[PDB]
DNA sequence: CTAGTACCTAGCTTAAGCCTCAATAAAGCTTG
């Protein structure tokens, strides 16, 4: 049982790289859309006791505007990751000048680690993801419309144009898959471009709470 | 586990009572005698 | 079902901003029917340039 | 009444000739209030004791007399729902009754 | 808001048309001076309809925006639907 | 074959009152490529989705007291040629479901060994004899433990397929919308009739995360599950589709104004605001 | 003695509170 796991890890990597491209981090097209054969030749076809193992298959990327803020992703070998198995990642967080990273766990993360990720969030804004959850890019689905993250100046422009306060907008909870996919705090509205069967295109704005 | 136990909730009784306990309380000490009143042909 | 639907939407209306807001001015739609148009003055039509 | 379980309200197959299929109120009592067919008659009840003495004298055995050895091949007699005894020959007792 | 900044529709909606007509014909019923020369009709509702058609109703409409502001639209100044 | 989709007023209730447990949760899984074109690969995808316990494949189960594994109280030369507890377990499968779902004794044995570890050894007959036997021992609360583990292994083992999806149907759709639609080189639409498959359970996440399954078009008819998997905006569109499905099923028409307003006010707060 | 009348005493569903079970860090041995 290694072809299935290699295919699973390849799709996880592809979805994570697409996630980084959508989030704004700098990724080349070659890594953006590579076939399964490139992953095989570059990692090794043998996830069970072989060279395509986690931890040195992890990805680091940087934002387009400035290569100062950087975003790692981490695939722990442990199914149920724990504090001692994320404090190492936090030590890497500190020893680098990096600010935020991802953790794609194998099984459900422990509540103690979840509470930690809550606790050092202001210093290090890092979040988690599931092995199961990242085998498909949900934005590619037909039901999910085009979500665009607004910057603060255009948020203020929107509010001044419509003469409405921040809480009167339609809102979106930070825990739902699209907002977690992009990676966005509360008080940050998202452009949502969807086709209207009545009049063409319709633009709606969801705020994170 | 074992599965498919038979209970008999009884009037003026708060909880269900297994039927074999009901028969033993009714007066049948043995087990063959109790089974003679439920399964009428032992070859099944 | 009808009463329950009505009690959930009974204060949703089109304001003079032409947007659609509930009783507490929370925006539901920026334009009514995401076009700003009345439902009683529309017709069925065919898009000739399609297919 | 006012219950969403329509199964009790439905016209059952065993209503043939004892309950009028057509006649029922159209309100919230559909199928719950049903009238009586023309020749349909409701039994008034009588003592089963004469039936008991008649039964106990042909070839049947009360529960206390027999052992459950011979109870599987014979037939169980119920009178007003109480298990009265056991008979070896169902036929020619049905005809007798 | 000032006369320069008017963002509401220039069309007199059906609700404004109903309520203005009602509240003007009520005034005519209470012997308010008519703004249009009548030809002997006695019904205040028809008198108010004639005034609306002639664009002479001495009433303006305060349209409250959702934010709290308002606009003062004169009945003579916005387009009547019918 | 699966028109227990509970349309009408019950579906309207299940949508308005957003219920965690709909009466008929079902998928509309589409297929990606050549599997969508031919029936054999569609069946191969079907068997990987339809949940299968070891009850589905076995004919009968029996336990014996063989003093010696070498003794072979049951006359089976396969065990003679193949060959520590005396109380063993024996289950007989059938060829019908076995070859319907394309399993092997090796796969079943490795599933047992992975689920239970090296607490037991499975001795399976080869796929040559007419009879389908695998024997179970326990390596070294003596036999009732074996009875309980037999019950547990029959109840839930997931030999093939994924949990909570009990039965999956397979058919070629006739309606154009459910059929795949493309655009040719001359700008036509060329309604394609490819294989699709509908279920009677719902996962929406272990399904799309499967090879040869189209993760772009698979709707799940379950509003709460869509909320958990795709997000609130996809919920609005799917809820609109399911709410329009019941209204347009009668052939009647309701203007999109009202459906859009209802699906907006039900989802304008970021969570599923059921109308109760 | 008794009477008349005046005063005393069928199913649903969904949240929501309540019952048990598995990681986990302090607390203290434990031997390296």
UniProtKB/Swiss-Prot annotation, chain C:
Entry PTM: The tandem heptapeptide repeats in the C-terminal domain (CTD) can be highly phosphorylated. The phosphorylation activates Pol II. Phosphorylation occurs mainly at residues 'Ser-2' and 'Ser-5' of the heptapeptide repeat and is mediated, at least, by CDK7 and CDK9. POLR2A associated with DNA is specifically phosphorylated at 'Ser-5' of the CTD by CDK7, promoting transcription initiation by triggering dissociation from DNA. Phosphorylated at 'Ser-2', Ser-5' and 'Ser-7' of the CTD by CDK9 (P-TEFb complex), promoting transcription elongation. Among tandem heptapeptide repeats of the C-terminal domain (CTD) some do not match the Y-S-P-T-S-P-S consensus, the seventh serine residue 'Ser-7' being replaced by a lysine. 'Lys-7' in these non-consensus heptapeptide repeats can be alternatively acetylated, methylated and dimethylated. EP300 is one of the enzyme able to acetylate 'Lys-7'. Acetylation at 'Lys-7' of non-consensus heptapeptide repeats is associated with 'Ser-2' phosphorylation and active transcription. Regulates initiation or early elongation steps of transcription specially for inducible genes.
Signal peptide feature range: none
Taxonomic superkingdom: Eukaryota
Compartments where located: Nucleus; Cytoplasm; Chromosome
Function: Catalytic core component of RNA polymerase II (Pol II), a DNA-dependent RNA polymerase which synthesizes mRNA precursors and many functional non-coding RNAs using the four ribonucleoside triphosphates as substrates. Pol II-mediated transcription cycle proceeds through transcription initiation, transcription elongation and transcription termination stages.
Binding partners and assembly: Component of the RNA polymerase II (Pol II) core complex consisting of 12 subunits: a ten-subunit catalytic core composed of POLR2A/RPB1, POLR2B/RPB2, POLR2C/RPB3, POLR2I/RPB9, POLR2J/RPB11, POLR2E/RPABC1, POLR2F/RPABC2, POLR2H/RPABC3, POLR2K/RPABC4 and POLR2L/RPABC5 and a mobile stalk composed of two subunits POLR2D/RPB4 and POLR2G/RPB7, protruding from the core and functioning primarily in transcription initiation. Part of Pol II(G) complex, in which Pol II core associates with an additional subunit POLR2M; unlike conventional Pol II, Pol II(G) functions as a transcriptional repressor.
Domain remark in the UniProt entry: The C-terminal domain (CTD) serves as a platform for assembly of factors that regulate transcription initiation, elongation, termination and mRNA processing.
The family this protein is said to belong to: Belongs to the RNA polymerase beta' chain family.
The protein's name: DNA-directed RNA polymerase II subunit RPB1
Name of the encoding gene: POLR2A
Residues of the full protein shown: 860 to 910 of 1970
């Amino acid at each position: 049982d290694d072809e299935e796991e290699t295919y699973r890890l390849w799709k996880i990597r592809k979805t994570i790289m697409q996630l980084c491209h959508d989030r704004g981090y700098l990724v080349t097209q070659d890594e953006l859309d590579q076939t399964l054969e490139e992953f095989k030749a570059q990692f090794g076809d043998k996830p069970s006791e072989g060279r395509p193992r986690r931890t040195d298959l992890t990805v680091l990327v940087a934002h387009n505007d400035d290569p100062t803020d950087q975003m790692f992703v981490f695939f722990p070998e442990e199914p149920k990751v724990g504090i001692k198995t994320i404090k190492v990642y936090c030590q890497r967080m500190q020893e680098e000048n990096i600010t935020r990273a991802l953790i794609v766990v194998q099984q459900g993360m422990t509540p103690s680690a979840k509470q930690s990720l809550v606790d050092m969030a202001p210093k290090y804004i890092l979040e988690q993801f599931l092995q199961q959850e990242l085998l498909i890019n949900i934005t590619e689905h037909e039901l999910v419309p085009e979500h665009v993250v607004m910057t603060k100046e255009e948020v203020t422009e929107l509010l001044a144009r419509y003469k409405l306060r921040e809480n009167q907008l339609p809102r979106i909870q930070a825990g739902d898959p699209v907002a977690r996919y992009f990676g966005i705090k509360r008080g940050q509205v998202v452009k949502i471009i969807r086709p209207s069967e009545t009049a063409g295109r319709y633009i709606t704005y969801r705020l994170v709470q | 586990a074992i599965g498919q136990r038979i209970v008999a909730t009884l009037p003026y009784i708060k909880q269900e009572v297994p039927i074999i306990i009901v028969f033993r309380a009714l007066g049948f000490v043995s087990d063959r005698d109790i089974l003679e009143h439920i399964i009428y042909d032992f070859e099944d | 079902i009808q009463r329950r639907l009505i009690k959930s939407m009974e204060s949703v209306m089109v304001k003079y901003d032409a947007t659609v807001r509930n009783s507490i001015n929370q925006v539901v739609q920026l334009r009514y029917g995401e076009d700003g148009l009345a439902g009683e003055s529309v017709e069925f039509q065919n898009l000739a340039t399609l297919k | 009444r006012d219950g969403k379980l329509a199964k009790p309200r439905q016209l059952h197959n065993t209503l043939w000739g004892m309950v009028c299929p057509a006649e029922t109120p159209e309100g919230h009592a559909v199928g719950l209030v049903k009238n009586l067919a023309l020749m349909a008659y409701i039994s008034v009840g009588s003592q089963p004791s004469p039936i008991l003495e008649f039964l106990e004298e042909w070839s049947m055995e009360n529960l206390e007399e027999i052992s459950p050895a011979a109870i599987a091949d014979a037939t169980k007699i119920f009178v007003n729902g109480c298990w009265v005894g056991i008979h070896k020959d169902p036929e020619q007792l049905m005809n007798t009754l | 808001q000032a006369n320069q900044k008017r963002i509401t529709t220039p069309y007199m909606t059906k609700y404004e048309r109903a309520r203005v007509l009602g509240t003007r014909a009520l005034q005519i019923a209470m012997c308010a001076p008519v703004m249009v020369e009548l030809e002997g009709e006695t019904d205040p509702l028809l008198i108010a309809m004639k005034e609306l058609k002639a664009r002479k109703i001495p009433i303006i409409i305060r349209r409250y925006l959702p934010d709290g502001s308002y606009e003062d639209w004169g009945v003579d100044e916005l387009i009547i639907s019918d | 074959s699966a028109k227990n989709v509970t349309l009408g007023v019950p579906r309207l209730k299940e949508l308005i009152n957003i219920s965690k447990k709909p009466k008929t949760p079902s998928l509309t899984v589409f297929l990606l490529g050549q599997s969508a074109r031919d029936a054999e690969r569609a069946k191969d995808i079907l068997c990987r989705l339809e949940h299968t316990t070891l009850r589905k494949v076995t004919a009968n189960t029996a336990i014996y007291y063989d003093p010696n594994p070498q003794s072979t109280v049951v006359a089976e030369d396969q065990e003679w040629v193949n060959v520590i507890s005396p109380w063993l377990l024996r289950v007989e499968l059938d060829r019908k479901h076995m070859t319907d779902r394309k399993l092997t004794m090796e796969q079943i044995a490795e599933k047992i060994n992975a689920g239970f570890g090296d607490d037991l050894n499975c001795i399976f007959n080869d796929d040559n004899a007419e009879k389908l036997v695998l024997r179970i021992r326990i390596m070294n609360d003596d036999d009732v433990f074996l009875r309980c583990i037999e019950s547990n292994m029959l109840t839930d083992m997931t030999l093939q397929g994924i949990e909570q999806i009990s039965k999956v149907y397979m058919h070629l759709p006739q309606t154009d919308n459910k059929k795949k639609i493309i655009i040719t080189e001359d700008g036509e639409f060329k309604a394609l009739q490819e294989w699709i498959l509908e279920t009677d359970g719902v996962s929406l996440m272990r399904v799309l995360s499967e090879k040869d399954v189209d993760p772009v078009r698979t709707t799940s008819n379950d509003i709460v599950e869509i909320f958990t998997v795709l997000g609130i905006e996809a919920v609005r569109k799917a809820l609109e589709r399911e709410l329009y499905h019941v209204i347009s099923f009668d052939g009647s028409y309701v203007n999109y104004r009202h459906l859009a307003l209802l699906c907006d006010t039900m989802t304008c707060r970021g969570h599923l605001m059921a109308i109760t």
